[PDB]
Structures are given as C-alpha cells and as structure tokens.
C-alpha cells in the first residue's frame, strides 16, 4: 500500500541526448542504470566533456546495491571514471554489471585514470542475462541491435510491477555482427502486463524504419571503391559496427587502414583483443602509411575524447600536426553532429570542399544511419508492451512529445505519459505514476585539469561579455580622485557615453571619499547608477567592472 | 578582342544565402542585380540586419546605368534603403527596374527611411519585360515561380555573348497565384548558345523536385482544420504566397486572421492594395481579436525586421508584450531557419512544447516547402541552357560544389565551373572565364541606430572574451606602485596564477617608473610578458586589459 512504490530519479539523459544515468529505488535499496558523459558543442571552448552531478548518489551511496550498464557508448559509461570516485572513492565492493565489450571499454578508461585494476567490482554478464539486485529488483536484460555490439535493454521487475526499459535501440534486421535483437522477454513482459515503459525517443519524429548498418556498409564500400586517392573517415570511437564496416570497405579495394585519435585507437585495440573487430592485415599509424600511394590509404579518425568534431575542425581550419587535407582527398563524415553542432559541421564541410576534398556527409549522402529506432520500430515496441504508463527518454522535449503523440495514436494508449526531466523524482505505484519532487541536479564541466576548472559562473559571465561587452571603470580614491573609463565589445552609441559615465563616477568617488565610505561601498555607488544610466540610454546591459583603489 | 570582356563582381550572395547583389560591367558601363540584406543569426544580439559593403559601387557610381531587382524578398531588395543613399545620396536619376510588387515593397521601405517619394527613379516593368541598359546590355527578364509573386530570372545579352541568370526559382507546376514559370526565353537562349549560366544552388543537394506551394496550402488547411483552439503561424513578412495560403486555411474554418509584426503588416497592406493578396473579411490586430473564442482565431506573426526568430524566441522565453502561449495553442513554423539558426529554433520548439502548445514544424511536419529548385528542376535548367561556363550562386560552398558535380554529370558538362566568392572579379570573354582579381568587400552591421553602431571590431573581441575570458590588471605608477589583478570567465587554473601575474606586473611597473617610461610603454611591458606567461602555463589566450594610471 504505502511503502510500496518505486522512485525513478533521472540525473541525466532526460530532455536531452547525452550523459545518461537513471536512479531506481525501492524502500532503502538503490541501483543505477548507466553513467554517461555528454560531449560539449563548439562555442564552449576549453571544455573537454560534461558529466552529470550525482549529489543524490553521493549522499545515499550506502543504499546502492548495483550499477548496471547497457552498452559501451560514451554517453552511457563515459562518466564513470569521474562519478565512481565521487561516490565511492578509490574503491568499492558494489557490483557493476555489463557485457564483455561494455566492461572491456570501461576498464580501458578506468585504468587510464589511475584507477587500480580490480579497484571496482565489475561483473561481466551476458547481454541477455538475469540478475538479482538486492531484495527488490530482478533485472532481465535483453539484446537490442544498436550502433555498438553488446547493447541491451532491461525488463525491471519490482515488487509493484514491471518496468520495461528499451535501452538505446533500433530493430536492425541485418546487423553487421549477425546478432539480432532478442524480443522474447519484452513480448512476454507485454503479455503479463507492463506497468511502465521507458523508451528511446531519439527518432520519434521519423516515419518508417531506420536503415540497417548493412545498407551503410554497402554504401561505404560503394563510395570508397570509387575514391581516386586517399580516404578519410570520421566517426565516434565507440562506433564499433561502423568501424568494422569501414575496415571491410578498405580491405575490399586493397587499402591499408591507419587510425588517428587516442580514444579510437584504444577502443579498437580492446575490440580487436576481445574479438569484436576483425582486420585482415592490421591497423597502422599515420607515419607507417605516409609513404603509400594515395589510392592505397584509408584513415579512420576522431577527436581526442572520441568525438569527430575536434579532428574535422583541425583538418579544416587550425591545421592538424600529423595530417593535412589535399586536393583529391575524399572525406567521409560517417556520423551525425552532436546536438548543437549541426551548423558548425556545415562550416567544416564548406571549408573541406574549399581545400579541394570530395566531401560525403549525411543526410545528403547515405554514409551514415542512425543507431536509433524510427516510428515503425517504436510502434512495434509500443504494441509489444502496451504499457499502462509511459516515460519517453533519450531525447529533447520535442522528441519526447512526438513519442507521446505516437503512443497516444495506438490501440490502447498509456493511461498517462509524463515528460521526464533531469533531477525530477517520479513515484510509481501499481496504480499511479507522478512527479512528486526534485533533487539537486545539473552538470559539471571537465577539461585537461579535471572537474571544476571551468564552471557555470565562468560560462555565465562569458556570455554576458559575448552578448553585451565590457566597461571597465578605474577609480583612484584619495584627495586627488581620478576616474578612467574604457570599454570593449560595447556599442559605439554607448561608448560615446563613457564621458558621462566618467563624470557620474567621479562624483560618486568624490562623494564616497567625503563620507569616508569603504571601497566596496564606493564600488556599489558607481556600479548601480552607471548600470541604470546606460541601459536607460542604450538598452544594453554590458558588464561593468568597477575597480576602486585607494591612492 | 581585348576590350571585349564582361566583368562580374559579386558583393554578396556568393558562398552564402543572403544579401544578394551582383555587379555587371562592360567597358565603362555598369548595372547592378539586386541589393539585399542578410538576417543575423542569434548569438549576434543587438544586430538587426546585415548589408553588403559597396565600396566598388560608391567609387564607380557615375558608370552605373541601372539597378535591376528580381523580386521583393528582403535578401534581394532589403539593403537598398541603406545602399542607395551610400552610393548616390538622397536622390538619383539612375533607373531602378522591378515588377509591380517588387517596387511596391521597395517604396514602402524607402518611405519608412525618410526617402522622399520619387527621390529615386523606380521604373515598373513586367516580370517578362525586355529592357536596354546603356549601350552594351539588353536584359530579357522571365517569370519564375518562387516564394513571392513577381519573381524573375534574366537573360543577359552582352557584346560577347549571353549570360543566363535563373534568379531565385523552383519549377512549381501549380503556383498559388496561377502564374507558372516562363521558360521560352531560357530554352531559346539555350538553342542559340549560352556562354555563362548563373543558377540558384540552394537545393543542389536535394534529389527530386521541390513540393508545390499548393501541397503546403492543402496541408495547412488540413492541420489548421483540426486545431482545437488558437493557431499561431510564423513565416517571413515577404512570403506573400504562404501568407495567402494561411489566410485561405483560416477562412475555410471560420477563423479571423490577426497579424503581428510591423514589416509583415506593412507588406501585407501593400500586397492587398496591389491585388496580390485577397481576404474575405479583413486582417485584424491582436486587440481586435483578444475576445474571440480560441477556435476562431489565427495569428500570423514574424519579427520586426521580417524574420520569425525574434517573435518565436519571445513567445518561448523573454515573453511577448501583446501575446502569450497557453496550453492548447497550436503553433506552426511555416518557414525554415536562417542559416546558423537551426538549433536555436529547435530550442524554441522544445520550449514551446513545454509551454503546452502543439508545435508543427519542418521538416518533421509538411507545413513548409522550399522556394528553391531541387535536382530534377536544376537538371531541366542545365539541359535547357547547356552553358559553356557555369557559376553556381545563392548557396554556401557545399551547395555550390554539389551543383558543380550535378552539372558535371550532364550530357554536355560546362567547359568550366567556377565557385563564386564575394568580392571576386570574374572576367568573361567569348572563349574564357576566370577570376582575375578582387575588390574591397564585406559586411556592415545595422541596428536601431543605423550602420556602424556595431562593428567587426566590437564583435571580434566580443568572441575573444566569450571564448577566453578577461584579465584586468590595474597599475598605479608612482612612488607607491600598486598592482591589482582581477579576472572574469577565466579558467580557475589560470586564476590561481593571478598572484604571479600581479608580481611580474609590479616589477614591470616599478621598472617602468625607474626608466621614466611613458605609461603606454609600461602597459606594453606588462601586457606582453603576462600574455606569454599565461598561455605558456594554461594554453589559453584571455583578453588582458592593462590599465596604468599615474598616481
Ligand atoms: Zn545513447
Ligand atoms: Zn547508444
Ligand atoms: Zn533569395
Ligand atoms: Zn528569394
């Protein structure tokens, strides 16, 4: 009755695509689903990656009975190297479940951060395994085709009912590794009755079905076969299926594959070791291939953190240290832009063409296919589960809304669909489902020096300047008061008002001296009036830095 | 032989979509094709619109024999209110040709800028007219279906051959005003021999044919008919065909049409007067409709300058003074985002859904169709003209390149295709076509106070701060030297280095005093060393504002 209710607390991945992490709780036992990162879009220079704030988990660490990872994509496990130490410290006994490849990639990262091997309790399971979590949760994972092998959804059985989480998925009828989705557990759950459905909303706006990775492999074979000279291919480091497809295409035309990008080299190494990747010869470095005929070279590349942008941007503008675009090169962008980078990629494409390269990119060219289900696939899942409650996930509000409308057009629509938000606390009972509160939530920014180096504050006033400009007022508080006003990125109309600013500042400074006021109070007497005056006369709110010095 | 060559100088519209203006010259006679503006993408706050720099025209004004306008879209005539006074002053005898609607909208704008009626010599012509320009140019305009009535291309006959300019176009088989494209002149030119083709590259990446404005009108009728309450529709003020379609849809379901947005009210007024728009009742204001049942109201709106963004952004965030979104409202974005605003619109869409509105937007919903030709239409034009030379225009580099590849796949590809750039000078002879130089070119920024208020400089260092932050060093040069260092939007790692900055600054200040150096030289002694030190220790180049005051 009362004590019977599951709490679902999303800390990332809701209303957005990235840094996925969802907390599940029944009474005093918790388990977490994934812990990803989010890549920063350009315009946020210096930032290497974003991670979810996990205050709630740091506070309730003792109640965490397990951490479950659905697959090895950066936005699902990418944050763990930072989050685990924040929650448990340098070590923990807590079971961290994941498939072979998922944990394989995770260890590569943990190790890379100085985390001792075996410091954390990683339990390798099958993509289709069943695991008991504490006294209240029985998890039945099921394999789903996606853009990385060993990907799962999970049927979450609780004391008050079943929750089906589709995980990230598409229903690829012909996956590159020959491992089709396993829907038995999902259909079965549907027939018994699904209380809540949490499903991938990425392509809820798209009619039809997502093309198979096999279609892309064949199209990649096609365009690479016709390439005159060198071929560059960019994609995420974790897109193992795409990488295999490229490798196959290269090998079909006698090309040797070189690889650039720390993360991708690392992940491919692991995939090769574990058997997920196969290469007839081997993977080379840029140097080892620098002297081969153009027609015999294919380069696979991505950014240092695993995303293509930084390397595409360098090939286009700043210039890359180990490689450079030349007329005749063929560049294939075999991935889609991170949300917020669409038009930054367009500029890269424009610039790449001007360098003389034949650029092939999506959606104009079929050199990429989403790793997520389109409407026909989502409808199949909706009918398979016919959930009482529905919580669209893995997508921005428009994606979530469109999935809601899609669900509402089914034979037996959900009793209710909530639009999930990060930090929201959802209460689920056998008969109800609602948001009952919130917990601290947000994002931490990471760069070469770790977390904290860059902050919301540093970014907030970085925009205040970018959009309004700067006005520096230098005041000398003494018996010989002096005021100097200078500005930057400020409107000319406003600049011509700096003389007036200077004078009203002097009066404030002189008056401040007379009253024997502290400098900070004199700073205020200057700041406020000047701020008011300027907006009242320009409609702009430039950043006003008043510096008052006694002397 | 020698003296025989036409010079084509693009000052805007090349390698981009917007602010179109192309200069044509033979010996000492010039004529200009259009003079548009470009809308600013968000991120460039304060800026109302962009205009082409016309130094070349201001210098050679005496040689200008005519100005020809192809249609009334803001990116073709929108800049004229600024450019004409810059080139000729308050008045000019120069013939400015354009169709009835084109000149109708132009006068509305000129008047709005204080330009006396008749100050400029506007010659109304038919969309299919023939006009003589000076001694060397004979222009044969031809009607082309587009997103505004009275739209033309032009066959430019010169002493060394024919140049076909498609103008902006698509081949709509069923235009809303029943005025189909007129291709006789184009096909005829093709049969006689076309020396150079200048064609609309907007959709050169798109296979097939662009949907008819009639398809959209019918789809708009469809979605508006099912709307429960109020309906908001956003689009450009100059999209007369779309406006008529919306008006028809509203009238079919007994809805009254209100209109918000100065520019759109102005343009619709003119269109109604001239007969291009028809309304069964009349157009109302927000107030006049504020008390009608939701189901009987349809609002047509756009930004003050004619673009939808500012009004969509206000309906979503800041809040609009005269109207507000409420649960149940239906909002239809019946236009595509300006280049660079795609993801800004996505945020608007997300926010609009969260306000409880049913949002319909392209491409997810067929509530908009491009006003430009897709590949099948472009191929038809290519075969119709089979030009010797080709100059893709009205699109960014990727659009231009794709059109080039498209041309190269034809039966008789052009002898050569050049990728046009703004400011480039192209020399055309009966046998050759090449870039032979450049002229000053660029963009001027316009806001409420006119041109110059915002500048490249103001923007350049506005980005330097946005991406690197600020470091203000305040130094008092006297016998009691004092140095204070403060920063904003600067990396914490760097901030912890402000103490060191402070000290190396003091030493520079004290040494400056000893040498009796001028303050500006002391500023340098501080600036440079500090700049070097910090990048050498953080890899960042923050803006360093050194302020040295004697006292
Ligand atoms: Zn994902
Ligand atoms: Zn994924
Ligand atoms: Zn145009
Ligand atoms: Zn146009």
PDB file of N, CA, C and O in Angstrom, chain B residues 19 35-39 71-79 109 236-239 263 267 305-307:
ATOM      1  N   UNK B  19      21.829  38.639 -48.585  1.00  0.00           N
ATOM      2  CA  UNK B  19      22.394  39.896 -49.084  1.00  0.00           C
ATOM      3  C   UNK B  19      22.963  39.816 -50.498  1.00  0.00           C
ATOM      4  O   UNK B  19      24.126  40.140 -50.748  1.00  0.00           O
ATOM      5  N   UNK B  35      20.018  44.122 -54.420  1.00  0.00           N
ATOM      6  CA  UNK B  35      20.764  44.715 -53.325  1.00  0.00           C
ATOM      7  C   UNK B  35      20.081  44.302 -52.030  1.00  0.00           C
ATOM      8  O   UNK B  35      19.427  45.109 -51.367  1.00  0.00           O
ATOM      9  N   UNK B  36      20.224  43.036 -51.662  1.00  0.00           N
ATOM     10  CA  UNK B  36      19.564  42.561 -50.460  1.00  0.00           C
ATOM     11  C   UNK B  36      20.317  42.702 -49.149  1.00  0.00           C
ATOM     12  O   UNK B  36      21.421  43.237 -49.087  1.00  0.00           O
ATOM     13  N   UNK B  37      19.681  42.239 -48.083  1.00  0.00           N
ATOM     14  CA  UNK B  37      20.284  42.258 -46.764  1.00  0.00           C
ATOM     15  C   UNK B  37      20.381  40.801 -46.341  1.00  0.00           C
ATOM     16  O   UNK B  37      19.997  39.896 -47.089  1.00  0.00           O
ATOM     17  N   UNK B  38      20.908  40.578 -45.151  1.00  0.00           N
ATOM     18  CA  UNK B  38      21.006  39.240 -44.607  1.00  0.00           C
ATOM     19  C   UNK B  38      20.544  39.392 -43.171  1.00  0.00           C
ATOM     20  O   UNK B  38      20.841  40.398 -42.524  1.00  0.00           O
ATOM     21  N   UNK B  39      19.786  38.421 -42.681  1.00  0.00           N
ATOM     22  CA  UNK B  39      19.330  38.479 -41.304  1.00  0.00           C
ATOM     23  C   UNK B  39      20.434  37.912 -40.425  1.00  0.00           C
ATOM     24  O   UNK B  39      21.163  37.008 -40.831  1.00  0.00           O
ATOM     25  N   UNK B  71      13.080  40.325 -57.468  1.00  0.00           N
ATOM     26  CA  UNK B  71      11.886  40.106 -56.650  1.00  0.00           C
ATOM     27  C   UNK B  71      11.977  40.820 -55.302  1.00  0.00           C
ATOM     28  O   UNK B  71      13.034  41.333 -54.926  1.00  0.00           O
ATOM     29  N   UNK B  72      10.863  40.846 -54.581  1.00  0.00           N
ATOM     30  CA  UNK B  72      10.798  41.563 -53.316  1.00  0.00           C
ATOM     31  C   UNK B  72      11.231  40.952 -52.000  1.00  0.00           C
ATOM     32  O   UNK B  72      10.884  41.492 -50.957  1.00  0.00           O
ATOM     33  N   UNK B  73      11.968  39.847 -52.024  1.00  0.00           N
ATOM     34  CA  UNK B  73      12.441  39.233 -50.784  1.00  0.00           C
ATOM     35  C   UNK B  73      13.499  40.136 -50.143  1.00  0.00           C
ATOM     36  O   UNK B  73      14.280  40.785 -50.844  1.00  0.00           O
ATOM     37  N   UNK B  74      13.521  40.173 -48.813  1.00  0.00           N
ATOM     38  CA  UNK B  74      14.473  41.007 -48.089  1.00  0.00           C
ATOM     39  C   UNK B  74      15.925  40.790 -48.502  1.00  0.00           C
ATOM     40  O   UNK B  74      16.719  41.732 -48.491  1.00  0.00           O
ATOM     41  N   UNK B  75      16.286  39.565 -48.873  1.00  0.00           N
ATOM     42  CA  UNK B  75      17.674  39.333 -49.261  1.00  0.00           C
ATOM     43  C   UNK B  75      17.977  39.682 -50.717  1.00  0.00           C
ATOM     44  O   UNK B  75      18.992  39.256 -51.273  1.00  0.00           O
ATOM     45  N   UNK B  76      17.093  40.474 -51.326  1.00  0.00           N
ATOM     46  CA  UNK B  76      17.282  40.931 -52.695  1.00  0.00           C
ATOM     47  C   UNK B  76      17.026  42.428 -52.822  1.00  0.00           C
ATOM     48  O   UNK B  76      17.608  43.081 -53.682  1.00  0.00           O
ATOM     49  N   UNK B  77      16.162  42.980 -51.974  1.00  0.00           N
ATOM     50  CA  UNK B  77      15.909  44.421 -52.015  1.00  0.00           C
ATOM     51  C   UNK B  77      16.058  45.041 -50.632  1.00  0.00           C
ATOM     52  O   UNK B  77      16.137  46.260 -50.495  1.00  0.00           O
ATOM     53  N   UNK B  78      16.109  44.191 -49.614  1.00  0.00           N
ATOM     54  CA  UNK B  78      16.225  44.663 -48.244  1.00  0.00           C
ATOM     55  C   UNK B  78      17.351  45.624 -47.901  1.00  0.00           C
ATOM     56  O   UNK B  78      17.255  46.350 -46.912  1.00  0.00           O
ATOM     57  N   UNK B  79      18.413  45.645 -48.701  1.00  0.00           N
ATOM     58  CA  UNK B  79      19.527  46.526 -48.401  1.00  0.00           C
ATOM     59  C   UNK B  79      19.482  47.883 -49.077  1.00  0.00           C
ATOM     60  O   UNK B  79      20.170  48.813 -48.666  1.00  0.00           O
ATOM     61  N   UNK B 109       9.510  50.610 -47.928  1.00  0.00           N
ATOM     62  CA  UNK B 109      10.732  50.681 -47.138  1.00  0.00           C
ATOM     63  C   UNK B 109      11.442  52.026 -47.261  1.00  0.00           C
ATOM     64  O   UNK B 109      11.833  52.620 -46.256  1.00  0.00           O
ATOM     65  N   UNK B 236       8.219  34.491 -42.969  1.00  0.00           N
ATOM     66  CA  UNK B 236       8.807  35.777 -43.323  1.00  0.00           C
ATOM     67  C   UNK B 236       7.720  36.728 -43.807  1.00  0.00           C
ATOM     68  O   UNK B 236       6.722  36.303 -44.388  1.00  0.00           O
ATOM     69  N   UNK B 237       7.915  38.017 -43.565  1.00  0.00           N
ATOM     70  CA  UNK B 237       6.939  39.018 -43.971  1.00  0.00           C
ATOM     71  C   UNK B 237       6.730  39.062 -45.477  1.00  0.00           C
ATOM     72  O   UNK B 237       5.639  39.371 -45.945  1.00  0.00           O
ATOM     73  N   UNK B 238       7.775  38.745 -46.235  1.00  0.00           N
ATOM     74  CA  UNK B 238       7.694  38.797 -47.693  1.00  0.00           C
ATOM     75  C   UNK B 238       7.177  37.538 -48.375  1.00  0.00           C
ATOM     76  O   UNK B 238       7.084  37.496 -49.599  1.00  0.00           O
ATOM     77  N   UNK B 239       6.835  36.514 -47.602  1.00  0.00           N
ATOM     78  CA  UNK B 239       6.331  35.279 -48.199  1.00  0.00           C
ATOM     79  C   UNK B 239       4.840  35.386 -48.470  1.00  0.00           C
ATOM     80  O   UNK B 239       4.018  34.727 -47.831  1.00  0.00           O
ATOM     81  N   UNK B 263       6.803  44.846 -40.158  1.00  0.00           N
ATOM     82  CA  UNK B 263       7.140  44.541 -41.540  1.00  0.00           C
ATOM     83  C   UNK B 263       6.050  43.739 -42.250  1.00  0.00           C
ATOM     84  O   UNK B 263       5.656  44.069 -43.366  1.00  0.00           O
ATOM     85  N   UNK B 267       3.952  44.976 -45.451  1.00  0.00           N
ATOM     86  CA  UNK B 267       3.982  44.263 -46.721  1.00  0.00           C
ATOM     87  C   UNK B 267       2.633  43.690 -47.145  1.00  0.00           C
ATOM     88  O   UNK B 267       2.297  43.703 -48.328  1.00  0.00           O
ATOM     89  N   UNK B 305      11.932  42.895 -38.154  1.00  0.00           N
ATOM     90  CA  UNK B 305      12.641  43.071 -39.416  1.00  0.00           C
ATOM     91  C   UNK B 305      12.112  42.148 -40.508  1.00  0.00           C
ATOM     92  O   UNK B 305      12.637  42.135 -41.622  1.00  0.00           O
ATOM     93  N   UNK B 306      11.085  41.366 -40.189  1.00  0.00           N
ATOM     94  CA  UNK B 306      10.533  40.464 -41.180  1.00  0.00           C
ATOM     95  C   UNK B 306      10.854  38.990 -40.995  1.00  0.00           C
ATOM     96  O   UNK B 306      10.287  38.158 -41.696  1.00  0.00           O
ATOM     97  N   UNK B 307      11.751  38.658 -40.070  1.00  0.00           N
ATOM     98  CA  UNK B 307      12.106  37.259 -39.820  1.00  0.00           C
ATOM     99  C   UNK B 307      11.416  36.751 -38.550  1.00  0.00           C
ATOM    100  O   UNK B 307      11.350  37.451 -37.553  1.00  0.00           O
TER     101      UNK B 307
END
